[PDB]
């Protein structure tokens, strides 16, 4: 129990320095400038932002997870989530087995848990995937950029007698041959144009021996903000987890080895929980953006009426300075934690093997981000290893800033206490 301040400052010389800085407007103003520069490093920059790298990493882990396991995943049935007699529904630009499409053609079995994914779930998954892959290919924006958009186009086909997954009821489109329809939804308005075309079995250059319907979806104005893309990634991983369909893998000779070889997708429990946790932490991190913006530190502080600065009365700016500095530190810490959730250096057993042998691997013959080839399947193809590396580099290059943020936080905390 320290009773007296000289005694307390004898033992803790750095506290003495802190008190001296807190009474000095030019040391306070210098810390506030530091916060403006570090905020810009976190929310304005990309490559050198730990926060940017961590967001990218959380999104890449979710996309990579589906690139690994999608080809193995059974799907099928008709539009109500019911079983089908003879429906083949194919989703393009998806990482199928030696294919840039995934085929849902499991009939008779009821869609559901440890069974095929329903086409309704697959459509949700697929849309999120297409959006994420288009954004990753274009490049994610800095965290402060909240109004960019991307355009996304994707297609799927239906064949087989009784297949209703491309019908008016499923699609919204009146004329199954040549009909088109537009709809919007929402604080950003995204416009979707859905169009349909029918190709007869014989007609012109029809590879497949028989007849099908093609659906094209074109989405304009899709928000590519960090928050919006993280919501897409959550939709992707959660749909997988909740639908929990049956899978059965093809293990290569030489290749890395997948255990188990057949099962249900939600059985990858450590993997899925990690990915969800990364997304959760990244959403919390991005959420600090508005705290930072709301408490800008660019206005200089000092006394009033030319009288000396009085740290007990003249410091109503301190609460906002503290909130800004704490929010920055929280961003940095959550960015770190996203990284450590997936970094294989601290993983063990089958989850480590999943990451090092599959997720942080790409078998495309590097292709840009968001590229789906006939060899994507069974590999992450989402720059996971490189993103972990870049996150670590950005953190090492944040050394000064982090100390400046702590010092600003401490100054502000001293002034909030004095003003109590």
């Amino acid at each position, epitope marked *: 129990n320290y009773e007296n301040l000289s005694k307390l400052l004898t033992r803790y010389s*750095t506290l003495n*320095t802190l008190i001296k800085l807190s009474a000095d407007p030019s040391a306070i103003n210098a810390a506030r400038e530091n916060l403006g520069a570090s905020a810009k490093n976190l929310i304005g920059d990309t490559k050198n932002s730990p926060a940017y790298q961590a967001v990218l990493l959380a999104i890449n882990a979710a996309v990579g997870f589906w690139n690994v396991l999608g080809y193995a995943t059974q799907c099928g049935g008709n539009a109500n989530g019911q079983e089908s007699t003879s429906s083949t529904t194919i989703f393009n630009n998806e990482p199928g087995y030696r294919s840039t499409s995934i085929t849902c053609s499991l009939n008779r079995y009821k869609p559901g848990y440890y069974g095929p994914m329903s086409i309704e779930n697959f459509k949700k998954l697929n849309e999120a995937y297409q959006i994420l892959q288009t954004a990753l290919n274009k490049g994610l924006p800095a965290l402060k950029e909240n109004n960019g958009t991307v355009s996304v186009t994707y297609t799927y086909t239906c064949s087989g007698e009784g297949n209703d997954n491309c019908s008016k009821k499923a699609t919204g489109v009146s004329d199954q041959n040549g009909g088109t329809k537009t709809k919007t939804q929402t604080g950003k308005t995204v416009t979707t144009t859905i169009s349909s075309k029918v190709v007869d079995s014989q007609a012109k250059g029809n590879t497949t021996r028989v007849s099908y319907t093609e659906i094209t979806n074109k989405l304009d104005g899709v928000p590519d903000s960090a928050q919006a893309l993280l919501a897409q990634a959550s939709t992707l991983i959660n749909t997988i987890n909740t639908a929990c369909p049956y899978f059965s893998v093809t293990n290569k000779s030489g290749g890395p080895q997948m255990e188990p070889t057949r099962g249900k997708l939600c059985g990858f429990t450590e993997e899925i929980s990690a990915i969800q946790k990364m997304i959760t932490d990244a959403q919390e991190l991005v959420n600090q953006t508005s705290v930072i913006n709301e408490h800008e530190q660019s206005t200089p502080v000092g006394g009033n009426n030319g009288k000396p600065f009085n740290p007990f009365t003249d410091a109503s700016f301190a609460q906002g300075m503290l909130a800004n500095a704490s929010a920055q530190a929280k961003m940095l*810490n959550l960015a*770190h934690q996203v990284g450590q959730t997936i*970094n294989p250096d*601290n993983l063990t057993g089958t989850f480590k093997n999943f990451v090092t042998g599959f997720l942080a691997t790409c078998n495309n013959k590097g292709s840009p981000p968001g590229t789906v080839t006939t060899q994507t399947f069974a590999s992450g193809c989402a720059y996971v290893e490189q993103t972990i590396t870049n996150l670590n580099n950005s953190i*090492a*290059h944040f*050394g000064t800033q*982090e100390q400046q943020i702590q010092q600003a936080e401490n100054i502000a905390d001293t002034l909030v206490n004095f003003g109590s």
Partner: nanobody, 113 residues
Framework: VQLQESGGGLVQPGGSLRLSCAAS????????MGWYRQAPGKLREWVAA???????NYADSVKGRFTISRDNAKNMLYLQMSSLKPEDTALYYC????????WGQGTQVTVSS
């Protein structure tokens, strides 16, 4: 768990010293690690950092004179200091980046004729 620096001492300007830092597995493994110093009348200053894969970077005040390294098999961090100057006098500390909240005791470096 913990952070334990050693190797400090009083030396002559122009001299050299090697600092060591023993870190627990949980602090060190898969983490960026770094050195810091706190000089009289000042707050703690960052000095150098090193990624798990071994990429070093440095504050301008020490670049070209100090070398940071890590030994991943033993959870040890090192700072080789050369061409030391009076201005390098300080308590030196290691930590991960971002920092674990409880610092070790640090090791005193004093440079003086």
């Amino acid at each position: 768990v913990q952070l334990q620096e050693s190797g400090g001492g009083l030396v002559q300007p122009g001299g050299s010293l090697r600092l060591s830092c023993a870190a627990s597995g949980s602090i060190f493994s898969g983490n960026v690690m770094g050195w810091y110093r706190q000089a009289p009348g000042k707050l703690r200053e960052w000095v150098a950092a090193i990624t798990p894969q071994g990429v070093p970077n440095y504050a301008d005040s020490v670049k070209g004179r100090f070398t940071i390294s890590r030994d991943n098999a033993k959870n040890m961090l090192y700072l080789q200091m050369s061409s030391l100057k009076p201005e390098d006098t300080a308590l030196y500390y290691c930590n991960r980046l971002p920092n674990y909240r409880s610092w070790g005791q640090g090791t005193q470096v004093t440079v003086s004729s």
